[PDB]
């Protein structure tokens, strides 16, 4: 399910990168940090 | 030699661009 939602945002960022917007490393770096934060708290509660 | 990351090209705010064009009109 986690692989499904990351494949959804993978095809979403492919749709972003087809449309050629500015500042994609900054924005998808922030969002990769956000998914890393959410996966950290999910792994924390899962190890609990 | 990594991907040395580019500087974030920022959209200028409407107040700072309007004070810039206020300075441009006031210099005209």
């Amino acid at each position: 399910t986690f692989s499904e939602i990351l494949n959804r945002v993978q095809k979403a960022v492919d749709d972003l990168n087809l449309h050629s917007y500015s500042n994609l490393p900054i924005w998808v770096n922030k969002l990769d940090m956000e998914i890393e934060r959410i996966l950290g708290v999910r792994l924390q509660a899962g190890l609990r | 030699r990594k991907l040395v990351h580019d500087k974030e090209l920022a959209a200028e705010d409407e107040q700072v661009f309007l004070m810039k064009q206020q300075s441009l009109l006031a210099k005209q």
Binding site: - | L18, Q21, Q22, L25, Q28
Partner: protein, 42 residues
Amino acid sequence: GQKLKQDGDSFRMKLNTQEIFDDWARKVQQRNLGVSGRIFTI
């Protein structure tokens, strides 16, 4: 028909529209509108 001619004549001179046009043209001479300038204004 004396009274109809009198009252419709009074209503006819009430229905002259010359003063509205002359006050309108007076207002646009008092405005004196000019197009020209910088096409953005801040």
